[PDB]
Structures are given as C-alpha cells and as structure tokens.
UniProtKB/Swiss-Prot annotation:
Biological processes per GO annotation: defense response to bacterium; innate immune response
Taxon lineage: Eukaryota, Metazoa, Ecdysozoa, Arthropoda, Chelicerata
Principal subcellular localization: secreted
Intracellular or extracellular location(s): Secreted
Protein name in UniProt: Defensin-1
Highest taxon listed in the record's lineage: Eukaryota
Cellular component GO terms held in the UniProt record: extracellular region
Residues of the whole record sequence present: 25 to 56 of 56
Induction behaviour: By septic injury.
Length: 34
C-alpha cells in the first residue's frame, strides 16, 4: 500500500485541467500533474 496512490493525485490534476497526476518518489505535501 503506497504512501501516495497515483489515482487520487490523477483525479486531482484532471479536475484542474491535466490528463495525468501522481506523487514524487520521497517528499511531498502537493501532487505532480501531467
């Protein structure tokens, strides 16, 4: 079970206007998009 499952970031990026989203490899308070 990941510390950040990409689907939650993915839906959070697409709702802003992107097509993809995920967390970084180590340290994060916010997602990465496209």
């Amino acid at each position: 079970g990941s510390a950040c499952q990409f689907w939650s970031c993915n839906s959070s990026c697409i709702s802003r206007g992107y097509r993809q989203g995920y967390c970084w490899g180590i340290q994060y308070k916010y997602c990465q998009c496209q």
